[PDB]
Amino acid sequence: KGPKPERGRFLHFHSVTFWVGNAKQAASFYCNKMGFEPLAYKGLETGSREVVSHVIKQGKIVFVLCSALNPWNKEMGDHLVKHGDGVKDIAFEVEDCEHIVQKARERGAKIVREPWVEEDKFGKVKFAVLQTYGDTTHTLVEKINYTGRFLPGFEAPTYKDTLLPKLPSCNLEIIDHIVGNQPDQEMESASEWYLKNLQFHRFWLRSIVVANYEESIKMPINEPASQIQEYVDYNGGAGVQHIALRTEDIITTIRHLRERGMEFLAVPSSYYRLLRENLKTSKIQVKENMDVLEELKILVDYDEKGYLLQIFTKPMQDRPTLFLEVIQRHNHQGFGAGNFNS
Amino acid sequence: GPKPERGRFLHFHSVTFWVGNAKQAASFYCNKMGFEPLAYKGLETGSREVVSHVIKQGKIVFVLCSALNPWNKEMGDHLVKHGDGVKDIAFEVEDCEHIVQKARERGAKIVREPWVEEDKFGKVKFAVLQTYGDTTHTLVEKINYTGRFLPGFEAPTYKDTLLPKLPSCNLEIIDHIVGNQPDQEMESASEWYLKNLQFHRFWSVLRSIVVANYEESIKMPINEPASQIQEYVDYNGGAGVQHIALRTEDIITTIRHLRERGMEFLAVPSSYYRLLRENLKTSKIQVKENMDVLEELKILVDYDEKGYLLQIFTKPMQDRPTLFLEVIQRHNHQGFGAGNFNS
Numbered sequence: 001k002g003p004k005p006e007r008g009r010f011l012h013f014h015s016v017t018f019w020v021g022n023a024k025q026a027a028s029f030y031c032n033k034m035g036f037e038p039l040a041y042k043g044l045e046t047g048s049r050e051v052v053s054h055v056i057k058q059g060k061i062v063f064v065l066c067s068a069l070n071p072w073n074k075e076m077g078d079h080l081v082k083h084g085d086g087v088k089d090i091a092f093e094v095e096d097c098e099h100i101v102q103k104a105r106e107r108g109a110k111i112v113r114e115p116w117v118e119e120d121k122f123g124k125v126k127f128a129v130l131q132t133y134g135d136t137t138h139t140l141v142e143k144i145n146y147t148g149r150f151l152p153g154f155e156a157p158t159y160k161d162t163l164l165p166k167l168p169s170c171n172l173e174i175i176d177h178i179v180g181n182q183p184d185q186e187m188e189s190a191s192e193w194y195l196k197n198l199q200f201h202r203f204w205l206r207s208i209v210v211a212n213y214e215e216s217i218k219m220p221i222n223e224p225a226s227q228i229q230e231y232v233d234y235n236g237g238a239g240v241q242h243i244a245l246r247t248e249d250i251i252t253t254i255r256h257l258r259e260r261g262m263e264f265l266a267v268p269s270s271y272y273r274l275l276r277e278n279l280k281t282s283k284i285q286v287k288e289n290m291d292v293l294e295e296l297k298i299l300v301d302y303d304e305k306g307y308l309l310q311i312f313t314k315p316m317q318d319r320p321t322l323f324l325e326v327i328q329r330h331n332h333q334g335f336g337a338g339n340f341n342s
Numbered sequence: 343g344p345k346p347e348r349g350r351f352l353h354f355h356s357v358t359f360w361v362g363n364a365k366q367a368a369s370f371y372c373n374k375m376g377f378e379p380l381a382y383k384g385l386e387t388g389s390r391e392v393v394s395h396v397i398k399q400g401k402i403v404f405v406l407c408s409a410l411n412p413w414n415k416e417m418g419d420h421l422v423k424h425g426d427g428v429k430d431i432a433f434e435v436e437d438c439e440h441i442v443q444k445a446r447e448r449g450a451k452i453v454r455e456p457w458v459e460e461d462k463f464g465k466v467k468f469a470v471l472q473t474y475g476d477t478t479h480t481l482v483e484k485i486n487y488t489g490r491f492l493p494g495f496e497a498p499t500y501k502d503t504l505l506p507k508l509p510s511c512n513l514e515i516i517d518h519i520v521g522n523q524p525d526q527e528m529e530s531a532s533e534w535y536l537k538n539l540q541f542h543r544f545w546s547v548l549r550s551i552v553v554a555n556y557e558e559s560i561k562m563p564i565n566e567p568a569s570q571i572q573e574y575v576d577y578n579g580g581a582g583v584q585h586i587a588l589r590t591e592d593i594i595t596t597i598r599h600l601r602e603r604g605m606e607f608l609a610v611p612s613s614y615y616r617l618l619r620e621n622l623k624t625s626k627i628q629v630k631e632n633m634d635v636l637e638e639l640k641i642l643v644d645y646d647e648k649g650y651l652l653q654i655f656t657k658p659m660q661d662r663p664t665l666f667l668e669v670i671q672r673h674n675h676q677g678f679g680a681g682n683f684n685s
């Protein structure tokens with residue numbers, strides 16, 4: 001686990017910022033199909049002339065959908081052309097932002113944006129931006145006084161989707177893990193970035209999972225050994241492969257996501273055949289009805305106390321890059337290890 | 343004017359959109375605007391550069407396209423320049439080759455010379471012409487083509503299980519597509535159609551010219567700033583499609599069902615309905631549709647007193663103030679809502 005960082009603390013995942021072709025429509029999609037609700041907005045009517053942001057939320061999970069407002073936006077434009085719709089930033093909520101940044105800077109990290117504070121009638125938030133793998137960044141968020149719904153400069157949603165209230169709740173709670181795919185031979189250095197610059201440790205296809213000291217933030221890093229390489233080809237470099245969202249009841253979550261029209265990967269019925277006979281001879285017993293798990297196409301993986309339940313959406317875009325995961329944990333910490341093979 | 347010797351522009355065949363995320367765009371138009379998945383072309387069918395989701399409602403066909411690879415020059419530039427928007431407006435035609443011949447000789451730029459595609463379900467001949475801005479027209483001439491859409495396009499690769507639980511919007515056919523032009527460019531843009539395709543000026547009753555095929559099944563309004571048209575041009579990066587109007591035979595049911603899906607439309611002052619009610623008193627047309635429900639739904643009314651139309655606009659389809667949609671219903675009336683600016 002290494003030494004306990006003397007200063008600073010990464011509390012949790014604060015938000016995930018997506019740079020997409022059409023933020024409005026991306027926001028419509030994640031709300032309707034994945035159970036998110038509109039939280040806040042920033043764009044032409046709030047005085048924001050370069051970038052639009054639609055902020056949506058479910059449980060603790062905050063996704064931010066961004067688009068350029070102007071033709072020939074260099075940085076957002078290049079990224080859009082390069083990656084397609086995908087993750088730009090992984091935000092962490094922290095204690096002592098200034099020290100985390102000092103430390104990261106000393107150790108070699110590139111500071112994209114030096115610490116800054118933004119305030120309203122609701123209080124102050126301190127921010128800083130660092131560069132991780134590929135074009136992916138981390139925004140550090142340190143709330144001082146704050147009482148606001150999301151962040152300073154973001155107004156109430158400009159819009160409303162009247163269908164949202166009529167669709168069933170998906171009950172997704174919090175971000176469990178966010179995976180970063182790397183080019184050939186860049187897994188060590190991508191992960192070393194966290195070990196050195198942020199004082200993470202190794203928590204736990206070629207993979208390595210890094211985690212903050214208290215292990216509230218988990219970030220798997222993969223390299224090809226290939227699915228990963230396909231990712232890289234279509235992403236044109238390193239980036240987020242999947243986001244895992246945790247639920248406390250995956251049967252209800254997947255039933256409601258499926259009712260909303262979300263599609264998941266196919267699982268052959270022999271998976272369940274094997275799973276049932278494997279389970280007979282073992283310590284662990286799955287609480288969730290096996291007949292319904294199989295109907296729903298949920299995967300199970302188990303150790304000697306616990307078991308995870310997990311399931312993977314179809315890609316969020318036509319490029320074979322980003323997808324989502326829904327996971328439920330029963331005293332287990334592994335990641336789908338067994339199901340990966342089958 | 344004179345009927346053109348050879349060729350016919352039967353109908354709007356479909357509208358191709360070039361978009362950041364084809365799959366999510368197809369999701370949006372299906373769920374919110376009532377379209378259904380019709381066909382697909384992408385990695386699974388052997389199309390390696392371009393992905394296409396084809397969706398349909400009544401006779402309206404929208405094609406949603408994205409590049410599959412990093413650094414697509416043409417589609418990448420288009421997307422950075424315009425955002426999500428219309429790339430191509432297909433016309434189904436008779437006698438593709440002579441239409442193209444005629445346009446070639448009167449000076450039109452042929453983006454793609456006539457060519458034929460063949461599927462096991464038949465043959466289709468295509469041609470591509472360049473119109474305003476980056477917008478093209480694809481000519482489609484079908485030779486007993488019996489497939490779901492066009493050769494090379496297969497079954498929709500997937501499903502959206504919510505679609506059948508949502509109510510029918512009953513949109514029938516494209517009524518008109520408007521192109522906004524930069525300052526001083528209406529004349530040029532409209533002229534292209536009179537000379538290269540042998541359209542004529544369409545009359546009825548911001549600057550605008552309506553242009554239309556002989557038979558008047560195709561109507562393309564051309565706008566120019568006086569301003570909203572300039573705002574469009576600012577955010578679009580140049581000329582392009584401002585709005586697509588979709589005809590319905592029952593706008594009350596259409597707009598009730600679109601609002602139930604969560605689509606949003608423009609705000610209409612309640613005094614508009616005060617003054618429409620007052621005016622209709624001394625008017626020789628009488629509106630069939632219940633006025634109190636029209637007001638509830640924020641539908642607009644225009645009437646020359648031989649007939650009338652009913653009209654309503656979506657919010658933008660994107661965050662840039664470029665493209666939006668129109669739902670229209672016609673009752674013996676050929677105008678386009680002119681009186682409603684002023685209302």
Ligand SMILES: COc1ccc(-c2c(S(C)(=O)=O)ccc(C(=O)c3cnn(C(C)(C)C)c3O)c2C)cc1
Binds near residue numbers: 335
């Ligand atoms: C997109 O084609 C595929 C292939 C495998 C998975 C897949 C499967 S599957 C569906 O094939 O059975 C099982 C577990 C995990 C999963 O989340 C995993 C595996 N390693 N890690 C770590 C964190 C170590 C990277 C994960 O997070 C994954 C990604 C998902 C989609």
Ligand SMILES: COc1ccc(-c2c(S(C)(=O)=O)ccc(C(=O)c3cnn(C(C)(C)C)c3O)c2C)cc1
Binds near residue numbers: 518563564655
């Ligand atoms: C503020 O955003 C909007 C949206 C629609 C109009 C708007 C209005 S509204 C309310 O503002 O008055 C009335 C009719 C039409 C309409 O479709 C129209 C007018 N001319 N043509 C032609 C064919 C001549 C271009 C049309 O197609 C349109 C686009 C105006 C502003």
Ligand SMILES: [Fe+3]
Binds near residue numbers: 168256
């Ligand atoms: Fe339910």
Ligand SMILES: [Fe+3]
Binds near residue numbers: 177179242244335336
């Ligand atoms: Fe995972």
Ligand SMILES: [Fe+3]
Binds near residue numbers: 509599
């Ligand atoms: Fe109804």
Ligand SMILES: [Fe+3]
Binds near residue numbers: 520585668
């Ligand atoms: Fe119109």
